[PDB]
Amino acid sequence: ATRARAASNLLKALAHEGRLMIMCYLASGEKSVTELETRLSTRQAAVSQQLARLRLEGLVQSRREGKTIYYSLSDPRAARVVQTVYEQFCSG
Template sequence: MASVSVDKIEKSCVEVSQILKALAHPQRLILLSNLLEGPKTVGELVNLCQASQSQISHFLTRMKLEGLVKAEREGRFVLYSVADKRLVRLMKVIQTEYCEHE
């Protein structure tokens, strides 16, 4: 097995802890779960998440700053999507392990 430097492990641990901290809110998890299905507008997320437009916008702004989501303008709409394929995989594991019932 290859040796991994302590600096690299520490850097990875810091990155992972920042991601987990950013995910540590139920509404953020709900937003990301909905974005796994594909890009969505704020209006679509308001309907899906049953939250106010200002709440959704606030969360999306924070999540964008934290690198969880990205925004692309399409005409007069802004479409939000998950920013990192690793986060997509992590969210799918969370859904499989904690959200799907047999």
């Protein structure tokens, strides 16, 4: 039950089309903000809040290389959950 509350909170963070899309893109490796926002249809202000939410939840981290910001998955539990989601829902 305690593990269920923790897992349910992760799934609430992931149960959002925009946040899930970001996580699916990061599931294949580190991505710059430029790449993410080019790939995503989301307006930039929305992507910005979504990235901040995933950061708050401990699911993504970021680093700087010059003027480029690179996000990557941090939480290994969420990484595997999202990888499973991505693979399962892309397999028809």
